[PDB]
Amino acid sequence: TIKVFTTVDNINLHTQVVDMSQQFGPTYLDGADVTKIKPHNSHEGKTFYVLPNDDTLRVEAFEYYHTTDPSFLGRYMSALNHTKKWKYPQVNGLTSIKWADNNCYLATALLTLQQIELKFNPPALQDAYYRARAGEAANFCALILAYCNKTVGELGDVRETMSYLFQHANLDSCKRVLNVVCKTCGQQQTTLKGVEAVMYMGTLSYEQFKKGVQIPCTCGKQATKYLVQQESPFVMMSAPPAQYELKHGTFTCASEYTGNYQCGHYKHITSKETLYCIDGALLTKSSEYKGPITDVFYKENSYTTTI
Amino acid sequence: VRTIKVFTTVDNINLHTQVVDMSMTYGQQFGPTYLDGADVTKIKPHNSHEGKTFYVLPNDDTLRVEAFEYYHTTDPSFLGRYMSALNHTKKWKYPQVNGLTSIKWADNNCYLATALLTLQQIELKFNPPALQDAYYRARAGEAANFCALILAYCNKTVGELGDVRETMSYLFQHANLDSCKRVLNVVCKTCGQQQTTLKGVEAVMYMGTLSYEQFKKGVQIPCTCGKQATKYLVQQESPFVMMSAPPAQYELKHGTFTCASEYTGNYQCGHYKHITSKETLYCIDGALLTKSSEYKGPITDVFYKENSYTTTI
Ligand SMILES: [Zn+2]
Ligand SMILES: [Zn+2]
């Protein structure tokens, strides 16, 4: 006989004596598949992830991961088997990722996540972000890939990754109020709540968003849309990549993207004592920056416009 | 102690007789239950339900097996979104506009309408039996379950603002485009020359330009040299190709393309329309049909039909 632990969370462990001769469901050990394995007595006392196969386990996995998808732990453990072999360099006080399996977009998001103020809802994300800040970001990246339905090696979007993670963050109290003025359609005001309130695609400049941007109305003409009010701990401004000048102290972080929609390399720029650009494990300093930026992140508390 | 005998299913192909007590709801006995799209999970069985077929989420091995054989998914929340959307899409109207099945406007269904019209003009063979069944009934004028499946496959709900390119992107993964091939060549005068071969869904989709002709001549793309490089189409093997770009003004010429997605607005909120090249250029906006000899407007997807192409450069 062998006495081992089964879990879905790795926080609530079920004592479950296993016989020497699967027999508990598809199971894993430290990220590795143990479906084929008969218990070695090297496993006495070890904990094994078991894909939920009961009501008690299934409600445990939901209170931790906030999802009922049975495929979640399978894609998580499969990503975790790769992410736990990644290197997480300490760059400029932040936890990064050394390049591997086209993880450039995942590293840029991870550096951004450590610089804006988010409160995650699922315990799995709360636990792993603090593990990531402690220097071991393997659980966090594996969960991010699982939540965005992506596999290791696959290419992704920084903006689209943040969008997925914002769905699992308590941004319910964040509010945005917009006014669009078309000259032949009038003046109309819109209120956005939740994730839609902190995300915009169309311009990188938070100042021009405040002063009003030109957008197509349904009349076909150019209409002016401007920010009336913003209640948020941050705002993410995005636009298709194009040359852009980042000025020190006027933003939090930024995503630089060289390439096109089919293939490109992400980089991360952050504003500290000067401009730091973090590639993977590489760091370059600069007082001025100008390059192809596609995301800029700003700090915010509460804003009301003058127009 | 009254009972009635109903039938449960996840595909309406395999039907499992179930005696259920009228003392308790369908939820306490099956989990989430649906009758013709209506959520009856907290309703206790009437006498009017006997003999009828209900939909429920997978709770057993064969219940999970049947759901995957049909929909090619094991997420039990799929049918919860599938039938909840069919509860709306069955009350939409599906008129025949210019020989195609369209959708009258409702709950921001323009992106589905434009997608639906596009699916009927390109050659698509779907993998999940649910899609191939609903797609044939969609061409017949009953797209209620085809669009319900599309929204569930795209993780989108009725009333949600949508994107046509994303929609086709999701449906393309559920289609057999295995035999589709694309070969591209990139040259930067500082990085050098390199060739790549893409298969399947990535072989029929490109984001960057609307002109299939320009793709063949070559488009200017950034290399991480810092310099601009030229990427051009070396070889294409597909029944169609979908070219996409951020919305901009564009001239559509009769007979040079199959169909096109018109988007007026911005990323946050805009309006889709469908342009199709027939004997002249027709615009389809839900149930509304207009036409013009030439066309200029904001276009974001252009579909071309293809056989096989090999370049001369
Ligand atoms: Zn207007
Ligand atoms: Zn180059």
Side-chain angles (χ1 to χ4, degrees), chain A residues 1-2 4-7 12-16 25-37 39-49 52 59-62 64-217 219-220 222-271 273-281 283-307, chain B residues 1-20 22 24-27 29-59 61-124 126-313:
Chain A
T1 36
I2 185 178
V4 291
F5 295 90
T6 62
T7 191
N12 299 298
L13 324 162
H14 314 315
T15 41
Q16 259 282 314
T27 166
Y28 301 88
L29 161 55
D30 288 339
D33 198 329
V34 292
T35 37
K36 213 203 202 133
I37 298 323
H40 311 163
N41 279 242
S42 323
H43 299 165
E44 187 150 58
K46 285 211 191 113
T47 307
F48 307 77
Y49 277 81
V59 298
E60 247 169 17
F62 182 76
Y64 197 66
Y65 301 111
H66 284 196
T67 170
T68 81
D69 197 339
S71 71
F72 187 83
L73 304 92
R75 301 184 317 255
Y76 166 63
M77 297 306 271
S78 269
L80 191 56
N81 200 68
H82 290 85
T83 66
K84 76 158 161 175
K85 293 162 184 153
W86 281 350
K87 303 302 163 214
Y88 297 107
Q90 290 296 300
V91 179
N92 203 22
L94 308 144
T95 303
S96 212
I97 321 167
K98 176 162 154 250
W99 175 87
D101 319 322
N102 302 289
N103 65 5
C104 69
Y105 81 98
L106 219 63
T108 295
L110 169 72
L111 290 134
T112 283
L113 285 149
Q114 303 165 70
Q115 270 167 97
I116 63 172
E117 186 211 299
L118 263 193
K119 180 215 143 190
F120 278 109
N121 289 336
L125 278 179
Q126 301 154 356
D127 295 340
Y129 169 84
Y130 284 122
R131 269 205 103 182
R133 267 242 298 178
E136 332 173 56
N139 287 348
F140 196 52
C141 298
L143 286 166
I144 286 159
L145 281 156
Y147 277 120
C148 311
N149 219 22
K150 290 191 107 90
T151 61
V152 184
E154 206 185 321
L155 299 110
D157 199 79
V158 162
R159 179 200 64 83
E160 171 185 349
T161 300
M162 310 291 326
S163 184
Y164 270 93
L165 302 188
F166 291 173
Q167 305 289 331
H168 291 295
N170 188 350
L171 303 162
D172 279 21
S173 99
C174 303
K175 183 154 52 192
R176 177 176 290 172
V177 182
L178 302 157
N179 217 48
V180 200
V181 279
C182 154
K183 305 216 327 162
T184 81
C185 297
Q187 159 173 254
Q188 169 76 66
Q189 160 163 307
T190 325
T191 291
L192 297 165
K193 286 222 70 62
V195 181
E196 280 172 346
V198 313
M199 288 207 317
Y200 182 82
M201 170 80 82
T203 176
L204 297 178
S205 183
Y206 195 31
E207 170 91 333
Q208 308 320 311
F209 193 55
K210 277 164 187 170
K211 291 326 214 141
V213 292
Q214 283 314 302
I215 52 139
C217 190
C219 62
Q222 242 189 354
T224 324
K225 179 207 264 159
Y226 67 93
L227 184 51
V228 171
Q229 190 193 327
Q230 181 65 45
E231 261 170 66
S232 175
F234 68 86
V235 172
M236 177 184 25
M237 305 303 288
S238 291
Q243 290 296 318
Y244 183 86
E245 172 185 350
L246 292 167
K247 296 177 221 165
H248 160 250
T250 58
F251 70 103
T252 301
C253 51
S255 307
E256 168 204 289
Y257 184 95
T258 320
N260 66 18
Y261 195 97
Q262 271 68 220
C263 212
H265 182 20
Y266 265 110
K267 269 198 223 150
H268 177 87
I269 290 97
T270 166
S271 201
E273 63 260 23
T274 177
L275 296 189
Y276 284 104
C277 161
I278 301 169
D279 191 355
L283 181 54
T284 58
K285 219 171 102 137
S286 200
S287 105
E288 281 186 9
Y289 174 93
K290 182 156 184 176
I293 307 291
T294 178
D295 304 291
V296 188
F297 295 74
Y298 303 82
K299 318 155 184 113
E300 187 53 87
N301 40 68
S302 162
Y303 167 92
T304 321
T305 194
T306 40
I307 321 172
Chain B
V1 201
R2 314 176 41 81
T3 65
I4 65 161
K5 304 172 201 274
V6 300
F7 303 82
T8 50
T9 195
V10 300
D11 51 19
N12 207 337
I13 296 126
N14 284 1
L15 287 160
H16 314 290
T17 66
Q18 302 257 26
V19 188
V20 314
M22 325 202 328
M24 36 209 192
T25 70
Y26 286 107
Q29 308 175 69
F30 292 137
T33 76
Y34 300 89
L35 176 59
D36 295 324
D39 195 350
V40 305
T41 309
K42 187 98 219 144
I43 307 282
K44 303 135 157 184
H46 309 163
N47 295 286
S48 324
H49 296 171
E50 178 135 14
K52 291 188 178 176
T53 293
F54 293 77
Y55 276 71
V56 281
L57 317 182
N59 293 319
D61 220 322
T62 167
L63 255 204
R64 277 171 273 147
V65 153
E66 289 158 346
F68 180 84
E69 288 164 353
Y70 204 50
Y71 308 102
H72 292 198
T73 178
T74 325
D75 191 4
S77 69
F78 178 84
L79 282 96
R81 304 166 289 157
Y82 166 45
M83 300 277 292
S84 170
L86 173 80
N87 199 52
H88 291 82
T89 67
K90 77 177 178 175
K91 314 252 82 203
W92 289 351
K93 302 288 217 102
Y94 298 97
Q96 297 293 303
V97 175
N98 203 28
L100 302 131
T101 303
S102 189
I103 323 169
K104 175 165 156 208
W105 175 89
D107 314 79
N108 311 303
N109 57 3
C110 52
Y111 79 101
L112 291 141
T114 296
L116 172 54
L117 299 153
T118 300
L119 291 156
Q120 294 161 79
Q121 296 177 254
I122 57 178
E123 283 173 60
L124 261 205
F126 279 105
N127 288 342
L131 276 181
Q132 200 47 73
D133 286 355
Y135 174 66
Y136 203 61
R137 301 235 283 123
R139 311 179 68 164
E142 302 186 315
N145 54 356
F146 188 42
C147 318
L149 282 172
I150 288 161
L151 278 144
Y153 279 124
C154 295
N155 202 35
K156 292 202 103 76
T157 57
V158 168
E160 258 180 61
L161 297 173
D163 178 290
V164 169
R165 192 191 53 88
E166 278 180 12
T167 302
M168 315 291 300
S169 201
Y170 285 118
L171 291 173
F172 283 171
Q173 313 275 349
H174 289 287
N176 186 46
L177 300 164
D178 288 350
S179 76
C180 285
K181 184 144 140 262
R182 163 167 302 166
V183 197
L184 299 178
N185 193 68
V186 174
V187 316
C188 196
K189 295 79 202 152
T190 322
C191 262
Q193 206 203 56
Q194 183 56 55
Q195 190 161 295
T196 326
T197 294
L198 294 169
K199 316 250 191 93
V201 184
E202 288 167 10
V204 306
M205 299 197 304
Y206 180 85
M207 172 71 97
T209 171
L210 306 177
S211 167
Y212 199 33
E213 173 218 31
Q214 196 60 50
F215 203 34
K216 297 162 172 178
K217 292 171 125 287
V219 290
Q220 292 308 109
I221 60 156
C223 215
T224 188
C225 276
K227 213 106 198 151
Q228 297 287 285
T230 293
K231 156 192 289 182
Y232 59 100
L233 182 57
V234 173
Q235 184 170 79
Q236 183 67 35
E237 258 85 45
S238 50
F240 66 92
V241 283
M242 185 213 292
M243 309 274 109
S244 286
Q249 289 282 310
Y250 190 76
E251 201 202 356
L252 281 171
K253 300 254 82 187
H254 170 259
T256 77
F257 72 106
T258 310
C259 51
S261 273
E262 174 197 281
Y263 187 78
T264 322
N266 58 94
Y267 196 103
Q268 273 60 225
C269 167
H271 291 294
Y272 271 113
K273 262 160 219 210
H274 181 77
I275 314 293
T276 172
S277 170
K278 286 251 212 316
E279 82 276 22
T280 199
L281 297 178
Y282 288 89
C283 174
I284 307 182
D285 184 16
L288 178 59
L289 177 76
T290 68
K291 75 172 175 190
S292 58
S293 161
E294 313 194 344
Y295 175 95
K296 176 158 191 170
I299 304 299
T300 174
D301 318 289
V302 181
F303 296 80
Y304 310 78
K305 277 318 233 159
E306 184 60 273
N307 291 311
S308 281
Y309 161 89
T310 306
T311 193
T312 56
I313 320 188

